Design a protein around this ligand. Structure first.
Ligand SMILES: *[C@@H]1O[C@H](CO)[C@@H](O)[C@H](O)[C@H]1NC(C)=O
Ligand SMILES: *[C@@H]1O[C@H](CO)[C@@H](O)[C@H](O)[C@H]1NC(C)=O
Ligand SMILES: *[C@@H]1O[C@H](CO)[C@@H](O)[C@H](O)[C@H]1NC(C)=O
Ligand SMILES: *[C@@H]1O[C@H](CO)[C@@H](O)[C@H](O)[C@H]1NC(C)=O
Ligand SMILES: *[C@@H]1O[C@H](CO)[C@@H](O)[C@H](O)[C@H]1NC(C)=O
Ligand SMILES: *[C@@H]1O[C@H](CO)[C@@H](O)[C@H](O)[C@H]1NC(C)=O
Ligand SMILES: *[C@@H]1O[C@H](CO)[C@@H](O)[C@H](O)[C@H]1NC(C)=O
Lengths: 485, 484, 484
């Protein structure tokens, strides 16, 4: 007749690795790595992205004829540009500080196109003949919609002096430009004056733009260039333009309210009509998990990116070395338990108030690991041009350096803490074995099989008494002494 | 008679968290995070900062007539500016590469102003009428002091050619400027020449400045602009100027000796006459702790910034077995003995086990604290309105380090608090098993962490249990008779 | 007569630290810090570096007469420059975006010089008279090899109009320049037109360079300057030039194909005809270790730089318990027994317990090593003197990761070293308990980790305890008679 102390077992094929042991098969386990994404672009904390479809920020702002998605997205959380946007700056040219404009325009609380300078304001200039084939609507010469290309009237280009005073109590992104002619004849056939200039003036702005007339290669059919510039006119300031020619003048402008920053996501996944806290270029994540293996370029309150394919914590115990050779599959109601063998019956009876302390403790470990990184911050990817490659490497080295920090720390944490969990189970069961012993030492033989050879025949009642620690060895003393000497 | 094994307890309400348990009351604790700061701007490693009051670096450098208060301080460690300096450039304009000059001048080991180009070097030119309302000394029209605004003399502005050969064995910060007019009438009225230029050339510098005459909105009453430029002249180089107008000419210059760098601190906190190794915009830290939560924009050998409000390490044993009782009566050691015999009762601590634990617990805390080995660096924010991308790259960096340090500092505390509390438990068990091995069968293992002496033990054999000098033969027969 | 439980000891003087215990001498150890290099510059993953001996990238790209080691390498993994290169721009001047060109040229998969504008293309200009004493070759005036300094012919400089269509299926790096003359007399002597220009135009380039005729300081004996500009002409694009004068015309251009990035290294070390995955300026690393203390500025897949001088993990046994005592005589194992009987005294080891430990501590060391992500390709970057703020940003990042990696590594060693020692203590105690249950009421627990056999035990009887097959009945009555 004997009683034994044991640990739970099940059908789990789940494996965890530890610092000193690999491919340990455990009963229960929880992966702290989120590997799933919805596959759709979604809203970020309630606000909808500005999905410029085959358009660029420059083409959308200046008003490329081919771009016809609604300018009326009043607020956005991030801009979604396709990589290599199809339609951008139809007339060959540039936009100064495109990348800084895009950054400002990444998250905008209020975007309202207003007309600041009417086409009626150019009485001595022609507003209808500033078109090019390169910028084409329905197979006809057209131009940028929100900017005007002014040419001569009656072989004359009288000097322009104009001003717009922002009266709107809201900042204004005003876009203007210069046309670079290809020859002196082209200069005198669109403008009339040979030497030209553009002056732009605000409180912060002093500009002098002179055309560069020289032979250039042809892009989109034209050997001339249009270089655009921008400023943010403050609530009560005036912008002053002066030109004797070569002026792509502002007609429309944009009201800007700037509160918060984001990035331009480059992706092709469709808007899924959803909301998320974390947005990847390939999908969106809904998770409290601490780490993720999806995409480096994430926007929102996102998990930390690591290179791991799996990060399996151990929420349970081993499946079938120590004094207790194996696990009892038949035990169902507890992790730690007793086995009573006597004449009345032999069965498995688990010990709660030991399993319960274990399940709460291991659960708190998992939750402490998951929640103590509530350091989740708003973060984004970035964009740098082809003459900022050195700054790009700083970004790559920072992003890669943080990756290697988390990947090493996370895996070691999993390996270190999983070992402690498995030994915490081995320590917990010995405390049950030691509690049963030290209460019946003389009456049973410590076989070391995890079992005690009960010299005294114990009924089902003293089994529960041993479980409750209420075994009186005087009550059962001599029946064991007869088997003893 | 019986002898008991147990641990110490006290009045402390200090609570610590482990990775597996929360709100665990312990006898002693240690927070490894610093929340206390001086509340004053102290000197950094012996050097007093350059506190500019309602002054910007540009206004202090160029000589804003309202900014001349801090003219003679030979060296400094960091520059203190208010968030919105009120004086700055009286005549509207700019200073090229301002934020790089600010960085260069954040830590200077020698600054001295010298007269490089006297006002007597400008005959045939006028040194007296270059004054504006925007720059005001005692309500009177004035202008920047360290630079000169030359204007025409006798309705003529002769082209001037001037050179300065630095001879001072130290580098010279030379500033100069161009005045952008507003109309052709303003130009001729100030400099008879209509088309103008400023050529500036050193060994490293080739500069051509031509004025931008155009209408602009007004600020500080003037619609014109003064764009300023600077260069560092190496100790045996010369700077060569040439202009036919619009030349804001250097009069004074500064000897620079830069042997290190810091940043500009934006703060209005008063100057306390103190010394510190770590300074924040809100105060100074002299802690040796690894982590801190005072301010992000620290400057110096500072702890690591974390988002925690508390980081409490367990240095005690009150909570977290079959010995589940903590003796509040024991007042001399962490682990100890309790003897109950017919002679009396008493508490006595195991000094060996207690001191071994104390020195080990103190090493665990000292390991975490002293292994940090922080480096010196400054965390100022020094990027302009068209440099926002670099500004975010700094933000993601210093926020990415926040998340690394906070997550690791928190778990380190949780992880090592568990080991500490189980270190205490196992140290208790070692005392129990020590006592058990001596009393093989001469006493009964009660199971509550105590032993029931079968024989009778006086106070001196109780001391034999403490000293490991218990004689099993002496009480063996007496105890054997006690059984049955 | 007695059997015992203990651990192995040797001559090892290796000292490690734990979180609670300092300077503990162990039997076996392993340092996870790499502290050695080969002292030579090696190939990076099978690709030779471009070693510009006392040459700058400008002096090699432009044809400095003394730097003109024409390319023998079609590709390179990184560029090795000296700290202060000695040749560079012989005629004083500048190269636009020099630091970004050095990033692009830092790793090149294929590089081939080609003649794009033959000197036969200039029939109305003098291609032979453009030399200077600033650029000397073999005692004679020379100039840059890969560019032509066109001057006037027959007191006439007709406006230049030239175009080069790229037809090479590869991108072309083209370099041109502008000469800044010192006076109007010099301008009319070398060129004839007094007001000049240089227009350069591709699909992505619109440029207008005008000379800066002004007095400058004398560098390399010349007060003139030559400012060079570069572009990358895409495979089916044309560059267009137009110059009134002051034109330093492209003669030779370079084919560029670019597939990776790898910084420029400043080292005086000599090439060693070797290959590595990790390179430092001091030497090259051949390590699988997680961390290193060799040089901050590495290139390749490298361990992590830290400030530590040693990161010694413990794989041994000594001086971790109350089964204390080390047996120097117990070779051939880590855990085992000491048998003392009339037949003699000897040691024996528990093979299964020892092997389970050496495999456990081996995995611990290999887990700390293998979980390292072997980084990526790496760099030490370079910024110029008006970019000191970004340098500070790069400094903060590199120094920030140091403090992160050092602290995490050091404390990881301290934490895992404690439990490695406690792993041995608990494994020894498990052998003690295994023997005690076989020796039930046949010996007495002395408490020092040794069992005094009540009966008399043979040599083979001792072996039965190790074997796990000790018959309590066979020696039952003898021990009862020895217990009085
Ligand atoms: C652990 O299991 C995986 C999956 O079968 C296997 O790839 C790996 O080799 C195993 N680890 C060891 C040490 O055998
Ligand atoms: C711990 O203590 C604080 C203060 O009483 C209490 O608000 C908090 O709920 C407690 N946390 C837990 C898990 O009991
Ligand atoms: C624009 O209008 C406001 C109205 O108060 C006026 O103060 C201002 O002078 C104008 N701003 C200019 C010319 O900068
Ligand atoms: C300045 O004076 C010294 C006197 O020896 C002279 O060598 C040096 O050339 C001068 N510097 C310049 C730029 O002329
Ligand atoms: C130290 O002990 C080992 C065997 O344990 C032996 O091989 C080695 O030679 C000894 N080292 C020295 C310096 O004596
Ligand atoms: C540990 O060993 C080193 C080298 O012998 C010694 O400098 C140091 O003082 C020792 N540490 C302590 C706490 O004794
Ligand atoms: C260059 O050559 C090809 C083939 O003749 C031609 O199609 C192309 O237009 C040329 N490009 C330029 C910019 O001249």
């Amino acid at each position: 007749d004997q009683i034994c102390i044991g640990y739970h077992a099940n059908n789990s094929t789940e494996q965890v690795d530890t610092i000193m042991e690999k491919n340990v098969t455990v009963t229960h386990a929880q992966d702290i790595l989120e590997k799933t994404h919805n596959g759709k672009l979604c809203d970020l904390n309630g606000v909808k992205p500005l999905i410029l479809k085959d358009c660029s920020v420059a083409g959308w702002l200046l008003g490329n004829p081919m771009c016809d998605e609604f300018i009326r997205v009043p607020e956005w959380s991030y801009i979604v540009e396709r990589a290599n946007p199809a339609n951008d700056l139809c007339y060959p040219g540039s936009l100064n500080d495109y990348e800084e404009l895009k950054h400002l325009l990444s998250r905008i609380n209020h975007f309202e196109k207003i007309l600041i300078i009417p086409k009626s304001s150019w009485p001595n200039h022609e507003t209808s003949l500033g078109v090019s084939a390169a910028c084409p609507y329905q197979g006809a010469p057209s131009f940028f919609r929100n900017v005007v290309w002014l040419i001569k009237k009656n072989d004359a280009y009288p000097t322009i002096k104009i001003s717009y005073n922002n009266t709107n109590r809201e900042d204004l992104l005003i876009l203007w430009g210069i046309h670079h002619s290809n020859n002196a004849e082209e200069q005198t056939n669109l403008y009339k004056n040979p030497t030209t200039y553009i002056s732009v003036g605000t409180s912060t702005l002093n500009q002098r733009l002179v055309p560069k007339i020289a032979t250039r290669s042809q892009v989109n059919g034209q050997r001339g260039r249009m270089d655009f510039f921008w400023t943010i006119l403050k609530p009560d300031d005036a912008i002053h333009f002066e030109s004797n020619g070569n002026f792509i003048a502002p007609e429309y402008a944009y009201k800007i309210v700037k509160k918060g920053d984001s990035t331009i996501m480059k992706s092709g996944v469709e808007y899924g009509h959803c909301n998320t806290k974390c947005q990847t270029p390939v999908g969106a994540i809904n998770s409290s998990m601490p780490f993720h293996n999806i995409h480096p370029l994430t926007i929102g309150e996102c998990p930390k990116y690591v290179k791991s394919n799996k990060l399996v914590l151990a929420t349970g115990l081993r499946n079938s070395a120590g004094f207790i050779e194996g696990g009892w599959q038949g035990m169902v109601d507890g992790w730690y338990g007793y086995h009573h063998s006597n004449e009345q019956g032999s069965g498995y009876a688990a010990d709660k108030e030991s399993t319960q302390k274990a399940i709460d403790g291991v659960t708190n470990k998992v939750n402490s690991i998951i929640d103590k990184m509530n350091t989740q911050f708003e973060a984004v990817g970035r964009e740098f041009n082809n003459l900022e490659r050195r700054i790009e490497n700083l970004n790559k080295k920072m992003e890669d350096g943080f990756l290697d920090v988390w990947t090493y720390n996370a895996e070691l944490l999993v390996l270190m803490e999983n070992e402690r969990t498995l030994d915490f189970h081995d320590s917990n069961v010995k405390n049950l074995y030691d509690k049963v012993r030290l209460q019946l030492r003389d009456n049973a033989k410590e076989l070391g099989n995890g079992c005690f050879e009960f010299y005294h025949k114990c009924d089902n009642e003293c089994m529960e008494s041993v479980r409750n620690g209420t075994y009186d060895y005087p009550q059962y003393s001599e029946e064991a002494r007869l088997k003893r000497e």
